[PDB]
Structure 1
């Protein structure tokens, strides 16, 4: 099995003990480490932080202690947007420029592969033509990686993609059957099913539906997303089940309705370290004082509330339940967003280093 873990190159700016650098990585924790994110300049792979070259060296240097470990570089992400992807896939010349630059870039810095994190072809302003052009891009990369292995005699560069769970995004952007053939693995973003964009509380990453849910709302859960990607032609061994080490938070309309589905007026208060309303790191929720934690029986995941703040998150138990699920489905492994949102240095939860991700490592 695979345990695929995302590193983020802006976690180095978190305050206090939440600051995360490559030295905070455990080289044995995961099987695959993915560096988020690279960017793009004139259709060519580029860095996004002043110290990326140094961090790349430290990141890929972890393989000196664990030669089984594989690293990948992720291009894209939310802030990157879509326009630069759209322009690069628009012509065969531009794709060739990108593909050649990716090979040189990954080999220069000692990455083992590329993870595609376009959010998303066919959506967020990307035109409908980008669905098939994404398929062509994946084919172009896969073909060029295969050819480069014959000329360098190194292990063939890996190609993965982070892919959405929501059927709207999947059908707008993803020829699942065609891209899954050319991807080494598929990192399913099985989270963000609910959040403070909604008018009622709901869980970030429930495993199953609640009974009150029917129709398209019965698809806003991990099981539905997994079934969709399997049905549409992803081999189970290539489907990697994403799990969140963060939760999504709400401000309740009234402290007098605290249920799942209770009215909410917007995002929860930003966390002291992550400072983004509507999400909290596991280490910001695990040690809430004076709160009430409960499990959503149907959905196999917890929520916690205190006063008018309500958070759906994942804990050790829900991670255990989801690994049991992925093994029953014969999936290829688990993926985690993100290393720096677990209690990576045991500073908050009194559970040791990486309590959530170490749970995955033990159960896989």
Structure 2
């Protein structure tokens, strides 16, 4: 199985124990660690943080302890636009400049491959993403001739049917990519006016205003569109999403006034790290959505949809049953990477729960 795990550049700046550098990562926890995100500047891949060259080195030193570990660098992300990516991919000359720049930069910084994180191609972009993926893979095949193991190419792909149909020619890109990480954890957000889970495995009996908004639907769709099982990697979040409740109702359908208050460490309304959530659960009431097979918890006017050891194992059993290539984790710095928040003295509880299921029968 693969266990693809993202590390984010910006996690280093969090206050106190929220601070996460790549030497916090257990070299043997994942099979591939993806460093997020690289910029494109002068139409060439580039660093983002002032000290990315140092942290790339820190990450890459993990292979001293675990020489089988693979690393990739993800270009794109939310701060980088969609529109910035569109401009590069849609013109043959910009596209070539970009593609040429990638292998030398990766080899300089000790990465084994590139992850494409264009978030996200519009309907005018679908055909240009196809061309980008094909041409980038061709450049990697060419570069392998110089004697070093061929660079890997992956892509992060959103899990909503509408976004997939808008931007991605899944049958074509899957031919050239070594794996596709499906982002099966953005199925609900504060843009809705109610509580709901963003990473349910199934729809649940609840109701079907929108069937589609669940991981099973997305995995089945990707396979239907021609992504081989052996290239499809299912995303599992270590963060949860929070809401501020509008009423005392806490239940399926409960109204919401906006995202939840910011976490003490992650400081972003509407999201919490798992370590923050372990703290939140003290004094909270816990519930599971039985049909959707994922938990939520509530305290005061705050309501948090999240994943725990049981729901992540359950997702790992599911993707092994569908014979997928493995799991992707967003993100290592949002698991309890210190191991000191969740009452069990165990670093990366959620990621090691996934790893242990994948390792069994």
TM-score greater than 0.5 by the shorter chain: yes
Aligned position for 1:194: 188
Aligned position for 1:182: 176
Residues 43, 84 of structure 1: 8 Å contact kept: no
Write out aligned runs for 1:27-42 (5 A).
27-42=27-42
Q: CA deviation at 1:83?
A: 2.2
Is 2:95 the partner of 1:103?
Answer: no
Question: In 1, Cα distance between the equivalents of 2:340 and 2:80?
Answer: 32
Aligned position for 2:305: 312
Question: In 1, Cα distance between the equivalents of 2:189 and 2:276?
Answer: 17
Per-residue CA distance 1:249-287 (angstroms, 9 max, x = gap): 1111112x1112211111111111111111111111113
3-state SS of paired residue (1:53): helix
Aligned position for 2:134: 139
Aligned pair count reads 356
Aligned position for 2:3: 3
Aligned position for 1:235: 228
Aligned-CA RMSD value:
0.9
Question: In 1, Cα distance between the equivalents of 2:93 and 2:279?
Answer: 53
Q: CA deviation at 1:190?
A: 0.4
Give the unaligned 5+ runs of structure 2: none
Q: CA deviation at 1:332?
A: 0.4
Residues 75, 114 of structure 1: 8 Å contact kept: yes
Is 2:130 the partner of 1:130?
Answer: no
Q: CA deviation at 1:117?
A: 0.3
Q: CA deviation at 1:212?
A: 3.0
Question: In 2, Cα distance between the equivalents of 1:195 and 1:84?
Answer: 25
Write out aligned runs for 1:109-124 (5 A).
109-122=109-122
Per-residue CA distance 1:9-36 (angstroms, 9 max, x = gap): 0000011111000111111100000000
Aligned position for 1:26: 26
Q: CA deviation at 1:129?
A: 2.6
Write out aligned runs for 1:211-222 (5 A).
211-214=205-208, 217-222=210-215
3-state SS of paired residue (1:254): coil
Q: CA deviation at 1:89?
A: 1.1
Is 2:263 the partner of 1:271?
Answer: yes
Residues 244, 337 of structure 1: 8 Å contact kept: yes
Aligned position for 1:51: 51
Aligned position for 2:70: 70
Question: In 1, Cα distance between the equivalents of 2:272 and 2:124?
Answer: 36
Q: CA deviation at 1:93?
A: 1.5
Question: In 2, Cα distance between the equivalents of 1:29 and 1:212?
Answer: 36
Question: In 1, Cα distance between the equivalents of 2:167 and 2:154?
Answer: 16
Write out aligned runs for 1:133-172 (5 A).
133-150=128-145, 152-172=146-166
Per-residue CA distance 1:45-81 (angstroms, 9 max, x = gap): 0111010001111111111111110000000101101
